[PDB]
Amino acid sequence: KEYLTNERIRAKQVRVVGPDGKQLGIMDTREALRLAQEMDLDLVLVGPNADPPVARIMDYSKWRYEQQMAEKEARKTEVKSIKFRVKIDEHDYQTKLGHIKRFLQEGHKVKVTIMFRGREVAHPELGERILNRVTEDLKDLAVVEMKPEMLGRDMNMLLAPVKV
């Protein structure tokens, strides 16, 4: 994802855009560089595809750093995927339910996802049967986000906390 700086800029007449919400026109590469120098914020080819390449006057590195930080923040609060079957047992089901409950308590969203084989005929019903029941059980902690929808080789149900 290269928004390109200073003399990473090959294009002749770049659309020299300012830092904020201003422009300087469609000016040369050298001109753009000079402008960047003036602001001390780098010249950055943020839209190369655009009607002459969009060349923002921004400090590139700092911006990138900020973006990275934001990304990191986004990493976390999160979603737990509880994977059911068609051939899954009653004790197993209970275990899964318990896990889901724990997750809810913690403050995590819940993708209860069923993983299917062949017999996508007597798969969907069983997926519903398990998942619906589970949802009914955890109603006290959980507002269902996504209902039991069959999606080709899988089935999803999702639960969100009522409150945390």
Partner RNA sequence: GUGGGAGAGGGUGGUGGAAUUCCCGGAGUAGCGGUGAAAUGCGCAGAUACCGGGAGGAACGCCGAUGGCGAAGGCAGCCACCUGGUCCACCCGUGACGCUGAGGCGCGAAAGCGUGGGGAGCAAACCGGAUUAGAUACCCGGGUAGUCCACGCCCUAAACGAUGCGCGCUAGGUCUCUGGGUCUCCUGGGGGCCGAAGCUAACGCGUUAAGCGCGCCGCCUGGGGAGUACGGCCGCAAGGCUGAAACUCAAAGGAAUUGACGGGGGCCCGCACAAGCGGUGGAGCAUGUGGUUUAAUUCGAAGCAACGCGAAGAACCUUAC
Partner RNA sequence: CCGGGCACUCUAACGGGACUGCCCGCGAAAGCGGGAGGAAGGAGGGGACGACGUCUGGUCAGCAUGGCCCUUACGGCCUGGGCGACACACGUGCUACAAUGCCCACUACAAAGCGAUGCCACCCGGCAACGGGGAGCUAAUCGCAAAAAGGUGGGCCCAGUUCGGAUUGGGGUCUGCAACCCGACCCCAUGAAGCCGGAAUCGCUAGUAAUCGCGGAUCAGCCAUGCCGCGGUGAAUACG
Partner RNA sequence: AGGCAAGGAGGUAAAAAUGU
Partner RNA sequence: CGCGGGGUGGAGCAGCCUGGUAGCUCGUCGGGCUCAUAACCCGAAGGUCGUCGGUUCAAAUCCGGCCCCCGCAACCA
Q: Residue 160: which H helix or E strand, with range? A: strand 154-161
Specify the residue, 33 or 60, whose C-beta has the smaller distance to RNA. 60
Q: Choose which of 89, 152, 163, 164 interacts with RNA (CB under 7 A).
A: 152
Specify the residue, 36 or 130, whose C-beta has the smaller distance to other proteins. 130
Residue with token string 């294009």: 11
What does DSSP assign to residue 118? S
119 binds, among RNA, other proteins, none (CB under 5 to 8 A by kind): other proteins
Residue with token string 């990493």: 75
Specify the residue, 59 or 120, whose C-beta has the smaller distance to other proteins. 120
Residue 91 makes contact with other proteins by CB under 8 A: no
Residue 122 makes contact with other proteins by CB under 8 A: yes
Degrees, nearest 5: CA angle 100-106-111: 40
Q: Choose which of 72, 75, 91, 118 interacts with other proteins (CB under 8 A).
A: 118
Residue 13 makes contact with RNA by CB under 7 A: no
Q: Does the CA dihedral 133-131-95-121 come out positive or negative?
A: positive
Q: Choose which of 117, 139, 147, 153 interacts with other proteins (CB under 8 A).
A: 117
Q: Which two tokens stand for residue 25?
A: 């026109």
Q: Which two tokens stand for residue 118?
A: 């062949």
Site string for RNA, 62-101 (x = CB under 7 A): --------xx-xxxxxxxxx-x-----------x--xx--
Q: What is the DSSP string of 83-139?
A: EE-SS--HHHHHHHHHHHHHHHHHT-EEEEEEE--S-TTSSHHHHHHHHHHHHHHTT
Specify the residue, 12 or 117, whose C-beta has the smaller distance to other proteins. 117
User: By the criterion CB under 8 A, which residues form the site for other proteins?
Assistant: 86-87, 117-119, 122
